[PDB]
């Protein structure tokens, strides 16, 4: 991790966080599998998500993280859900120069697959056999362990 | 359906707990469906076997003629092998007989909780 100080500029390699010793699952090629977290994390587990996210909420590159694409998509989706849910107060977006929040009320959301901005309203709900389905969750998280009698309903 | 279904294999014997030798003698058959809306041949066979009432136990011989009749109505019946753990009942013990759900006909009914 190199940081630039500034005309003459000076870059110093600074201390980088080290992975804790003794992984629970050694022989794991991917960091997520090394800790047996393949199917047991959710967007609510912000602590894990923050490690892979930029200070302002941007995604870190997969190559630097080194984790497999499957978890990368899962982690990216989880962060997006947390960000849209306002669950990352310390990773909020950087305001361009001096902007301020719109000050309009912010609706509380969670399990948001898509941005609320780009989702159109559903005027017609439909009849008995024409009911429209409401997407909840993401397909990337289908494999997550379920503790219910029946598999979770993606469409509400 | 292949004829192997009625030709048993050692794995099938273990699954159903049936010995390949000493084949069982008697069948237990109960009607589990209605004969309404079924073709006449199915209706005739059910009447011949006497399974007019559903959920009614019927004892049949495990002989080729009976086996052919049961095969025609296989889908409408449940087949279980009757077992005589204590052997055939005697005339004196004929009044103490009782048929268990397991398929075993005891020749003595003591009215005591097995627990």
């Amino acid at each position: 991790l190199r940081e630039v100080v500034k005309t003459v500029i000076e870059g110093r390699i600074t201390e980088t966080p080290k992975a804790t010793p003794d992984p629970p699952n050694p022989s794991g090629q991917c960091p997520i599998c090394r800790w047996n977290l393949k199917h047991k994390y959710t967007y609510e587990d912000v602590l894990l998500l923050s490690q892979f996210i930029r200070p302002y909420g941007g995604m870190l590159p997969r190559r630097v993280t080194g984790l497999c694409r499957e978890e990368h998509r899962k982690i990216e989706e989880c962060v997006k859900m947390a960000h849209r849910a306002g669950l990352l107060p310390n990773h909020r977006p950087q305001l361009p120069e001096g902007c301020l929040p719109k000050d309009k009320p912010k609706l509380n959301r969670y399990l948001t697959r898509w941005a609320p901005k780009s989702v159109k309203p559903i005027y017609k709900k439909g009849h008995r056999w024409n009911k429209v389905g409401m997407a909840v969750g993401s397909p990337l998280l289908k494999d997550n362990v379920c503790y219910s009698r029946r598999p979770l309903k993606m469409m509400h | 359906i292949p004829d192997k279904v009625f030709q048993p294999k050692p794995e099938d014997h273990e699954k159903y707990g049936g010995d390949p030798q000493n084949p069982h003698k008697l069948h237990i058959v109960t009607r589990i469906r209605s004969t309404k809306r079924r073709p006449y041949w199915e209706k005739d066979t059910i009447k011949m076997l006497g399974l007019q009432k559903a959920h009614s136990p019927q004892i049949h011989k495990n002989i080729p003629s009976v086996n052919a009749k049961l095969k025609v109505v296989k889908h409408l019946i449940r087949i279980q092998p009757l077992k005589l753990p204590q052997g055939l009942p005697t005339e004196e013990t004929m009044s103490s007989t009782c048929l268990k759900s397991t398929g075993e006909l005891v020749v003595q009914w003591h009215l005591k909780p097995v627990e």
Binding site: W129, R150 | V5, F6, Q7, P8, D12, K15, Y16, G18, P20, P23, H24, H27, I32, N62, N67, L70, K71, K74, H75, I77, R78, I79, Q80, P81
Partner: peptide, 27 residues
């Protein structure tokens, strides 16, 4: 139209029961 979880299970049970019927007709 899709099928109720109840209907799928019921046929599976009956098919298995008929399979047991087959074996006892095999001896």
């Amino acid at each position: 139209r899709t099928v109720s979880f109840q209907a799928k299970e019921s046929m599976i049970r009956r098919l298995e029961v008929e399979a047991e019927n087959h074996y006892w007709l095999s001896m």
